[PDB]
């Protein structure tokens, strides 16, 4: 095994060097009232990492629209990072606009538990989604061999943000859940007094005292969510390789 | 601040009580040469959890076609599990065909590190993807308030199996990656002599020494993957609560 | 091979989650000047436990008349508890008015020694009778396979209360003792004086120095108690399965 | 707190001195295929204990009818045991047919956890129901100041034996349960499949997959049980104080 | 071996439960100005002990006349002590005036070294003769099998009181000594001047320097003693067995 | 605060210097099949000790007839023992037949706990009565100031020897007990079977279950016993001082 920070803990305090200069996590993001997705990759100048970083750049304004910043992690140098970014701009025509953490001896890696058994020296494809309070809201561990579905990360942070906003719980596959479509869920009641009270109010739709829901999501909220998935699903019109 | 087993490690050898009887992990699945997805949820008779089991159930057929068995996990007794399975069948019309671990003391949860600081007692929405060799291939930790995208887990397993058999890495957002679409990446070369040999071989497409792909996935394997993501994106015709 | 709190000891301080919310034992019931009977059962949605919970419910008023609150305890979740109470409301037409502690990591079970060699995960049929001072006055440990006789818990609480207020001890089988029927016993002399003085006063009936009694219980007290045992003893008029 | 033996363990191995001789527990009873009730009491030449010993005495033939021996426990000298047995036979005309353990150094008291906070020198009113395999089946800790209800102890072994004999769980207040009367519960299913094999079968009366019962006990078996409770209920016609 | 209090040591400080209620040894008898005789015995309702307590009772006046209180001791409950005194009065017609300590743990027994090799649980026939100042003056240990000669116990206290008050030593078998009859001995001189001065004064009878004596006891003091030994020697008038 | 040998322990092994030569205790005496009576005394050339040795001396034949040798004990030299013995022979005209131990370093004093708070140098007036199996049967500790009653030591050995051979216990003040005179007590029964078999047999006279006796002592044994106490009681005809 190996240690990781846990959902509901504040992200570990740490000063990191990135290719945008030094930043203290998670405060930098907290102080701007912003979320950050931090995401690790094994090595600059490798192809899946490239496809991955292009995906994240291609959706930068989708993440800016939600008040979420991006930050890569990798044990390559700051000089390695800027030359890789220069490659991608040159050979693919994409500026990579967000900073990348440099971590040469593996300190930040070790701290976030990003060294698994594939490799003693290269991080896995780890994802830490953090809220404006500086709290880890979700963690994904993808291997070396498999690139992430960046659109699922978007659905997470939108869904989470509606949840806290609307005091609600998000069903499976939202906003295309097969039971209650784009319905958000009301936290199950923890006493019999709330159970009965809630039922009597008919302020909600109900399958039973625990499963109560409604559609407080704005039309645009739901479309923002559904675009994320339409895009994930859509075969690409042109490929960025046919202009390189 | 929490211990977990790691990508590349054997799934911890344990015996567990399920509402289908006692089974050894990962032994039970290795014997049959099946992969398995093990997912946790905080309690029976909660609503986000109910959506997840129904999602997993509607896709059971899909998982079975890949050779993936499913197994749930929570701290509730077997007697809750079967009473919650019964409730779902009478209210939503869906039989849940896969076993659910019962872990009333939190033994299995502490061993897989599914007790995050959202709860001392209730498991978070963990996902372990284990191959037929009994090795953890991917781990997802969603929280209490957010249901999972079950179609992403299908993509993950499909991609990972494809990667293994074709001896390839899988680009971001496959099979709809913006650079090489449904192409699979040749693992990056680890010497310049190799890199040069590869370019001269002529037999891959290449953006550079370290970025070669081809399209070795069958037409069918790709449309299977593409269906997963499209189902995820579609707004459903019939909601399941309606015909209660 | 197990530790338990002892008769004469204050019930141990603990905050507990119940399906009526968080409460501190024994402080919650001491506050109100009330006795309480905490009782435990293996698991929700199990038949014997169900029969027991009905039987306690049907005697709720008998217990309220005595100033006795009831509280349940299992390792099932608050969401299992309410789902069950509801099953009982709808299948049997009986509403469980008293709270049930949920205790999903076995903290309370372990603290009260309610885990015995029949099961490591599920609690035996323990009964704790605590007076209004917060003191443990009786303990019953029944097993999985055998339901309790609730009327005996009624008899136990009633007699103890009489005993307390009347400064009297209570013969076997009270108030149907073959030697003194509904009599109550003078605590035996602890000296020769007390013995020869008592026998000289005609305050009491006697068989010897140490066996002295009187009949100080109101005919109401004694009918309350005999009413309990008569119910225990009577083949029931109609079953609750019959009008389901 | 203080340590006790637990339901489902072998009765601790011990050689005890009784007023019938030295015997080994549980071997003496086991080797005769007999169950035993070991019950304790603070002191000889005290009135409540006296009501209790007379209470077991009048029920000796009903215990023998069930295959059950009795044995007492007190820190008094085997000399006190006989004098006190004499007194009772003299001044009440009842002979106490069964042994009483002498425990002058409270060795057996301490091994059985029968010295509570009440008295450090005198045992509480403990009851260990031990079966034909020397396995503890039930424990009951009554205080100094409250006689036991010996017929509940008859109801317990009667029910345990029926449950053993017929492979059944005994409902609350059996054989007069408000729900199924004299019915005996089929232990609930532990898997989704066993659960459905039960219902489709139609072999038993059911409220749901977990709540299944039949009437396997004989009419003599049920009358025996009832007789016990009716004896508890029925007001005594003659008191034994009337013929000192 | 075993530990005992020593002749010349202040009686150990202790609070005892007795059948006349709690008292504090030796201060209880010190503050009253009285000597006391503590005597252990094995067990209540045994015959030797019975004979000894009657012998003590039948001499209670002789002892009170001398300013000496009796107190027994044995491991039995206060409750046996009362029943045993009651039997002695009903069957033999003597009532036991003096207290009997209850030592049901063996605390006083261990603390006075009265648990000897014959029995781990029952006390031997110990005797402590404690003076006005609360000092142990003499100690006798008789076994289980041999009742004491109580008139020797009276001789001892009488002889000590004359010794103490008259400033003298008491010869062998006083007051019937082969050599000096009722005479009391002048403590041997400890110097030359003292031995000279003694011989020359003829203040005493003397066989030599060290052996000197006079007769300074009153006729009462001597007759009171001779009478103790007379009682011991004289076969009894009428036996207390031919009346009950 | 003193270690001593116990009733029921073998007298301790030791090689000792006496004025009849060196002897191994208790082996020297267990060899001859003879009991023995060890009596320490403060110091040679002191008056009480002399009167006590004269007394022991005058009873030498009474002791020999019983099968019982004597050994005195004292921290003075062999040479003081002989010089003192000679003084007695000259001045009182009694030869001391029995040996006396010399203990100048107080080893034997120490080893038998005869060094009490009266004096840390001079042993008190202890009496060890040892049987032919070399086992301590009785102990008496007297002080400096109080000479022993040697007739009681004779009564003890006679009574003890009788009780051993006859398999009886000895009442108080035997052979002149106020209840049963010269009777000897059947040791009390330990079972209920034994107790009532006794009552109906009429093998013995009985006050109750536990109290039975008979007169199995020969006329000679009783007179021997009763002439011991006669002597104690009787005012001596001629004192031995008168002819010095």
């Amino acid at each position: 095994p190996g240690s990781i920070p846990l959902i509901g803990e504040r992200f570990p305090e740490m000063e990191v060097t990135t290719d945008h200069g030094v930043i203290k996590l998670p405060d930098h993001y907290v102080s701007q009232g912003k979320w950050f997705v931090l995401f690790s990759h094994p090595a600059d100048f490798t192809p899946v990492s490239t496809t991955e970083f292009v995906s994240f750049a291609r959706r930068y304004e989708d993440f800016q629209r939600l008040g979420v910043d991006l930050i890569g992690l990798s044990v390559d140098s700051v000089f390695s990072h800027i030359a890789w970014k220069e490659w991608i701009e040159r050979h693919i025509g994409v500026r990579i606009p967000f900073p990348i953490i440099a971590d040469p001896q593996g300190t930040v890696a070790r701290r976030l538990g990003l060294l698994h058994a594939e490799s003693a020296t290269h991080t896995v494809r780890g994802v830490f989604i953090v809220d404006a309070r500086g709290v880890i809201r979700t963690m994904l561990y993808y291997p070396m061999e498999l690139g992430r579905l960046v659109d699922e990360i978007l659905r997470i942070v939108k869904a989470l943000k509606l949840g806290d906003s609307l005091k609600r719980a998000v069903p499976a596959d939202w906003p295309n859940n097969e039971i209650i479509g784009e319905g958000l869920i009301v936290p199950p009641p923890t006493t019999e007094d709330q159970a009965r009270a809630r039922m009597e109010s008919g302020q909600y739709r109900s399958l039973d005292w625990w499963f109560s829901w409604d559609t407080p999501a704005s039309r645009d909220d739901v479309e923002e969510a559904r675009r994320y998935l339409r895009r994930a699903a859509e075969k690409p019109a042109k490929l960025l390789y046919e202009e390189a």
Side-chain angles (χ1 to χ4, degrees), chain A:
Chain A
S3 228
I4 64 165
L6 294 172
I7 290 181
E9 297 177 336
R10 144 173 260 261
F11 186 88
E13 204 67 41
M14 47 170 68
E15 280 232 290
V16 304
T17 298
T18 86
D19 54 22
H20 286 208
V22 167
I23 84 187
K24 170 144 260 166
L25 295 172
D27 316 1
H28 179 67
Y29 295 111
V30 161
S31 352
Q32 308 173 23
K34 274 200 177 308
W35 289 49
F36 61 97
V37 174
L38 184 150
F39 66 96
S40 55
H41 80 280
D44 307 348
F45 287 105
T46 69
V48 166
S49 298
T50 315
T51 71
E52 261 174 336
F53 269 69
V54 175
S55 210
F56 270 97
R58 274 278 180 187
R59 297 167 174 73
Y60 183 80
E61 288 300 30
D62 274 350
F63 277 109
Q64 281 293 99
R65 208 166 291 121
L66 297 180
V68 193
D69 287 358
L70 292 176
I71 177 153
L73 188 278
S74 150
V75 309
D76 300 86
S77 76
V78 106
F79 315 110
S80 212
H81 285 357
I82 303 170
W84 190 42
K85 289 224 189 122
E86 206 209 324
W87 184 88
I88 287 178
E89 194 175 16
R90 267 203 143 69
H91 293 249
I92 309 246
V94 177
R95 253 267 131 271
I96 305 295
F98 47 85
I100 311 174
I101 299 167
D103 188 31
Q105 301 293 121
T107 324
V108 190
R110 240 171 283 104
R111 208 104 145 57
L112 292 161
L114 285 178
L115 301 177
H116 299 215
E118 291 169 320
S119 171
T121 70
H122 316 305
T123 49
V124 296
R125 294 183 196 286
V127 197
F128 297 86
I129 297 168
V130 188
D131 67 9
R133 290 148 15 207
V135 173
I136 294 175
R137 295 304 297 274
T138 296
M139 290 182 285
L140 312 166
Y141 297 98
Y142 281 68
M144 306 311 191
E145 64 273 6
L146 206 207
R148 284 158 290 193
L149 186 79
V150 186
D151 284 303
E152 174 51 16
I153 296 156
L154 279 168
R155 185 192 70 100
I156 282 162
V157 298
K158 171 55 142 205
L160 238 32
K161 275 200 137 212
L162 285 170
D164 317 347
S165 175
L166 304 204
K167 315 283 165 173
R168 290 284 184 281
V170 198
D173 317 305
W174 183 92
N176 298 305
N177 186 260
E178 314 99 288
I179 311 183
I180 69 159
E182 37 159 284
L184 301 199
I185 270 157
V186 200
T190 75
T191 76
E192 313 241 62
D193 260 9
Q194 291 175 208
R196 269 182 308 268
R198 160 109 99 250
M199 281 318 88
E200 292 172 359
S201 99
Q203 175 176 235
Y204 309 119
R205 285 149 266 196
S206 278
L207 263 22
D208 221 315
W209 57 272
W210 40 282
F211 202 153
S212 349
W213 89 93
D214 59 358
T215 84
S218 94
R219 244 140 223 172
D220 276 355
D221 286 335
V222 181
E223 257 149 5
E224 229 205 325
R226 235 175 232 120
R227 187 183 55 267
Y228 300 160
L229 306 177
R230 318 212 84 80
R231 173 167 53 192
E234 174 165 4
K235 184 175 155 159
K238 208 178 168 281
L239 300 177
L240 301 175
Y241 98 75
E242 285 170 287
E243 52 145 4

